[PDB]
Homo-oligomer: 181 residues x 8
Amino acid sequence: PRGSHMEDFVRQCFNPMIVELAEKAMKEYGEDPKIETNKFAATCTHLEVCFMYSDGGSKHRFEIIEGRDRIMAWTVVNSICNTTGVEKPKFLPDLYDYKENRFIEIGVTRREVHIYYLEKANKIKSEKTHIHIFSFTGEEMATKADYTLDEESRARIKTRLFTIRQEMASRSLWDSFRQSE
Amino acid sequence: PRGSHMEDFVRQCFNPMIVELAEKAMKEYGEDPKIETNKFAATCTHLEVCFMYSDGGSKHRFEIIEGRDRIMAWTVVNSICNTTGVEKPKFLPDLYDYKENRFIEIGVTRREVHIYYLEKANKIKSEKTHIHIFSFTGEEMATKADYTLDEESRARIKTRLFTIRQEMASRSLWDSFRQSE
Amino acid sequence: PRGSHMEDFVRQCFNPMIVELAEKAMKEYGEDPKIETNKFAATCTHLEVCFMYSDGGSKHRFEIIEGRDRIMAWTVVNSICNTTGVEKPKFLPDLYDYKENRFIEIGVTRREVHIYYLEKANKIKSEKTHIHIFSFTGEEMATKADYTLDEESRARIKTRLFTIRQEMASRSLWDSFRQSE
Amino acid sequence: PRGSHMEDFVRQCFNPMIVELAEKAMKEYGEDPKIETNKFAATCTHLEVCFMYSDGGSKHRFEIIEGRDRIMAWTVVNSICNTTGVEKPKFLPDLYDYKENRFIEIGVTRREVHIYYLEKANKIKSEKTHIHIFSFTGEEMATKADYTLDEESRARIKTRLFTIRQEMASRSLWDSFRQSE
Amino acid sequence: PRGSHMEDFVRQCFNPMIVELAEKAMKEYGEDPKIETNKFAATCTHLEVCFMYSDGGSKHRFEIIEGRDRIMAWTVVNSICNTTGVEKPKFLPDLYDYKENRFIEIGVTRREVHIYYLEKANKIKSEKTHIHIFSFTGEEMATKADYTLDEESRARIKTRLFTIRQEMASRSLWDSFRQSE
Amino acid sequence: PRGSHMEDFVRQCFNPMIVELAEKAMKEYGEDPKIETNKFAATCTHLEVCFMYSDGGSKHRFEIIEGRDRIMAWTVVNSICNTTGVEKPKFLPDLYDYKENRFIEIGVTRREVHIYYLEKANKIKSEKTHIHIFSFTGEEMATKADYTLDEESRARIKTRLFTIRQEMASRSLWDSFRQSE
Amino acid sequence: PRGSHMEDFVRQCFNPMIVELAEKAMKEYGEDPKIETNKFAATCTHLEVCFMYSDGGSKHRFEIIEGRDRIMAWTVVNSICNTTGVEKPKFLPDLYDYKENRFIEIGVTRREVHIYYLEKANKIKSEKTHIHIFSFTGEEMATKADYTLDEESRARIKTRLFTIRQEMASRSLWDSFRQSE
Amino acid sequence: PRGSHMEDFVRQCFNPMIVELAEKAMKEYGEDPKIETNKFAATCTHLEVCFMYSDGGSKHRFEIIEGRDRIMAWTVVNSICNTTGVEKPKFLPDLYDYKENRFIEIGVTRREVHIYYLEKANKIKSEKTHIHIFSFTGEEMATKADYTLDEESRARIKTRLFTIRQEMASRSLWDSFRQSE
Ligand SMILES: COc1cc(CCNC(=O)c2[nH]c(-c3c(F)cccc3F)nc(=O)c2O)ccn1
Ligand SMILES: COc1cc(CCNC(=O)c2[nH]c(-c3c(F)cccc3F)nc(=O)c2O)ccn1
Ligand SMILES: COc1cc(CCNC(=O)c2[nH]c(-c3c(F)cccc3F)nc(=O)c2O)ccn1
Ligand SMILES: COc1cc(CCNC(=O)c2[nH]c(-c3c(F)cccc3F)nc(=O)c2O)ccn1
Ligand SMILES: COc1cc(CCNC(=O)c2[nH]c(-c3c(F)cccc3F)nc(=O)c2O)ccn1
Ligand SMILES: COc1cc(CCNC(=O)c2[nH]c(-c3c(F)cccc3F)nc(=O)c2O)ccn1
Ligand SMILES: COc1cc(CCNC(=O)c2[nH]c(-c3c(F)cccc3F)nc(=O)c2O)ccn1
Ligand SMILES: [Mn+2]
Ligand SMILES: [Mn+2]
Ligand SMILES: [Mn+2]
Ligand SMILES: [Mn+2]
Ligand SMILES: [Mn+2]
Ligand SMILES: [Mn+2]
Ligand SMILES: [Mn+2]
Ligand SMILES: [Mn+2]
């Protein structure tokens, strides 16, 4: 344990509440944020994107599933299913859209949004669950070209993603981060 | 007094301000939250629903009548009546709709929304007061099919209701809660 | 000094910030809130109405002139005039409407809105300044029937006014308050 | 160092966070707020205008570039460029408009908005960057007559500017401030 | 209900947390603070004195028994008894002195401290429980002349008591308050 | 009104709560802080010294009389008198010492502490009231050479006084301040 | 997972910060607070006692070792050792006493303090580390009869311990808690 | 600029207020915290030690000179001198001891406390100014062996110093930090 300068960057780069939430998620899965630090930065990035995503749109539009502990998120998923009638997904998604009546799986990738979306779409058999991918280069890929949010909201997410990339490269940790996924 | 694990659940499940407001309501009616704990959970659930309800819509759209002490709520009801011209209801309602110019009676039930609405509609002789029922299973029933709020707002209330049900069943207190109303 | 139970009511009835602002206004005009307590309650009521009024509408829609000290309010009035081109009013108004490009004089009365509006309209030679009157009975009177705000926003002001009236009558201070203006 | 009453005015006139941000900006450029106090008041005024500007419009509409340190602002500019495709400006702007897809250069002047806009438009070779000028007299000048914001929002900025002018003249520091730019 | 100007004084005179605690105490005993207002002022006064009392002395010196609900205070009393060995009192006291190893019964009276102490000492058969009386005139009477606290601390309590008396007399509610105990 | 740079200094120099308290004191006595600015700085300085004074010593040692409005301070003085037995002073003092059982009159002077103490001792016929003088040069003069407080506490007051003097001289307002008392 | 009413009690009984710290400790050791709930209550109780313990005595007297993550606590232990000269303990203790120059191992037991102290003293070969045991019945056992703290401070810990016991028995979870250690 | 992982450590290691104060100090002296990062960590360490130092002892015992801007610290030094009579030091010290009537120069070193004290004692011609040195290894050296503070307070400073050393070595930045002074 200890020694990784990715850890000090992650702590100085991200909101402290997001960092505590990423630590719980990895510790729930038997991973050490001080050891697997590239996944520590990835879990923080994925968490923040999900939060800025639900921040886009109306006030009660989304239900945040990511960031809850495994049991609570599954409890909320059931309540959404058993009241809207939508089918229970096989894997925990990140958001639910009360406006569009679908769960959203949000992906952040260090490669082509084409490959990651292929990978994630091959995982969920429920083609009903919406998929929305973002990349650190500025691209995005969504189901049926339905990007759910306003252009301005998704622009904010892509900008924040590129800033995190620049700050990693400035600290010479980006190359290890990209060649880690 | 003391001993009920419904009490510890109610305290861990609901917002602490809602719990203090439910305690005042029952104590105003000569009921002990530590003894009649199923009504303690019911008064909390009814309180929260009324609060998420007024949270739906515009900022000045509703006037919260529930949660006030008996004298203050009746004082506010008079002021609404003596300025809008609407008729003074026989029983204290939960909300007033400045947008639709009617008081709202909000009901949460552990049975069919059909029976509860029948019961509540038979209580208020003023057919002018709007009735909106929710259930722990996900159904809702409103006057003239006028559901007052957006689909997304009512979806949030139904989801929260089903989560409270799951958490009660997980603690094996749901069966006593349903067969108590 | 001391002894008036209107003073304890005013302090328990109104927001503490509004009470401090009313005290400064009267003390600026050589009046004692502990002695002239009916005007103390009136200045609080007028202050709150002006605040709920600017709270109606959009975020940057109004400029609050009431509640500022005499020099600062006149400084803001000049800045509004010397940038919008509107004529400098002879008497300090309460609000300025950036949406309608006019100053608003807000009146709260214990008699007919017809008489008070006549009185206030006879004071301002600038017929450009908008006048909006409210009463403790629920009536309102505005210039050119232009009520500036939504129906729901003005309904909130009339309700709050009637609650203050009920609370005064319950404390038997209303009759002295009405027969004091 | 010390002695300037422009400094005490700037501290009493502006928000303390804006004052700390102006001090960092000048100290980054080798200027002393206690010595060059007219620029200290100017940097505060420019900062506040940029902040009320981004406050106009929608919640995620703008990206604040002014107020960041030189490296961070340039990092954010790159992220905006490398994700929107817009060209990297030669000089750091103040805002980016996600709604209009352009950087905004905001100018505050003590002379004609005609001269200052001429000066600033001659500096940026990128005619793509939008320019919006304000003056202490109440005028404004924008690119292609596209004023970006609502009439009410820009009216607030012009009023605040004229209040700062009045407060300087009342302290007899305005004449030195105008004949300093 | 409603109408008593003792109620508005009690709310303006006492800390709002103390007022909420007095309301719970009376409502636990089937008393209405809006009806029995002299006892409402008395319960507030007794509560504050107990709080300034525990505020005297060292940080962990006292255990506050007053202000807790009946079940919780009795739970704490047992824990003090079953760990210190002191005898369980027949009636709930107000404080426990970890420094002197005794429960303290704190009395506030509107008559002679001689009579009230006689009354309270005749109620507790446990002569082990310390008694400390205060009056609105400035006198105090304690067991074995052991006044537990510093002279300066008890002086603060007597001063606060006399201020409450003056404020009641100024509002002409003192005579009803004294001839009510 | 307006124009004095002593006003901007007073606002930037003193705690904002002390400034609000000084404004109320002068406005209670028919004085304008924007006009009589040397007294505005003096009332702030006297207020702060009284506050750092009560901050010296134990927690319940002093009762702050300065800073209260005239009626409330006299109410507290009576309560101190009618419970300690000390004689009611002819003029309102600043503090009461529960440890030494005497009221304290605190003076801040711009001349010799010898002259000011002579002046203040000639005003109070009650030789029982303790007098403690401070100067902007670093001297102090107290009754019976009883300086009430620790050496370190009074050293802090003298240092703060000399800093206020330096800041005034740096702004060239000290000479007017000294030749104003 | 889920179902244990010990969990709802632990959450309603203990400070929320202590509950988060207990969850991290168990999750660091591969234990689930929702499954092993008796240890969840035990870790909370041990945590609180350590905190009230360091709260006793002077402000800088102790260094809290418990509650830190394993790496940070060991880092602090080294710093204490490499600056005071004390020997590095084989097992992580809970506190360090700057006043007595020794680490403290704090134990809370559901049996005789005699047995637990025997067990813990047999674990640490460093007889230099001080041991202080508390029980839920009110007993305590310390090294060389040196109880480190004042009588009043340890009395508070024993009382709090007995209250937790009563609240568990009232919820019928005490018998499982005692027969679990 | 940018790239140093000492910067991310300094931000994650130290209190954010101390980091802002260190940045102002270096920027006042024409140094970049992002470039000269070893001095950035040193200025933070020196700042924290000075703060824990003044935290030792009584409440009004010290006057913090470090952390103020150059003009303000010199203003406070004059006020201390012109009221206590102590001689004005040639170089700005860190603290003033109201209890011992001397300025304190606090040094933190990465070598022998013997050499650094020799260096610092050779700089101040005023042998009246007290010198107190700390090292990252746990040693300390003070004037006349007068260590000013309690043993426990200085023990806390030495421990914190050794923790900062361990955290630097764990990040492999300690060797560059020690061989930089
Ligand atoms: C190593 O496995 C884990 C999983 C979790 C929770 C997973 N739940 C999700 O929902 C999830 N995870 C990821 C993801 C990532 F952010 C980084 C690396 C690999 C990933 F799959 N991307 C998503 O988009 C997503 O929705 C926590 C810790 N470790
Ligand atoms: C036992 O009687 C009471 C009544 C009150 C206030 C009643 N005022 C309402 O307004 C109210 N009550 C209820 C309700 C409930 F939430 C639980 C059980 C039975 C109910 F009728 N449902 C509503 O929908 C409603 O509007 C408080 C305590 N006890
Ligand atoms: C002396 O030079 C500086 C520059 C900076 C940052 C410049 N960056 C801008 O972006 C900037 N500056 C100015 C501006 C001003 F506010 C006052 C005087 C002269 C100016 F050019 N007006 C703008 O409109 C603007 O966008 C900080 C300190 N000193
Ligand atoms: C009407 O009876 C009640 C009792 C309680 C709680 C009693 N528990 C005490 O501990 C208590 N009560 C009183 C007291 C008083 F403050 C006012 C009137 C009469 C009193 F006896 N003086 C004390 O000194 C005291 O210790 C609450 C409401 N009503
Ligand atoms: C112009 O008269 C006033 C009086 C008050 C309240 C007086 N009450 C005191 O207690 C008081 N006043 C003064 C004092 C001063 F601070 C400045 C100038 C002259 C003074 F006498 N020095 C004290 O030491 C003192 O105790 C408020 C406004 N204006
Ligand atoms: C199952 O093992 C663990 C250990 C830890 C951290 C141990 N570190 C200590 O320091 C520690 N633990 C315990 C303790 C307890 F509180 C409950 C059960 C058994 C125990 F030994 N009593 C102490 O007194 C103590 O000092 C966290 C989670 N699980
Ligand atoms: C490069 O020069 C500077 C100086 C300052 C303020 C100096 N004023 C002091 O008071 C000061 N400085 C230092 C110190 C240090 F912390 C790191 C390196 C060298 C040092 F001398 N040690 C002290 O002990 C001390 O009292 C700020 C920035 N850069
Ligand atoms: Mn995802
Ligand atoms: Mn209802
Ligand atoms: Mn008006
Ligand atoms: Mn600009
Ligand atoms: Mn009592
Ligand atoms: Mn005085
Ligand atoms: Mn232990
Ligand atoms: Mn130093």
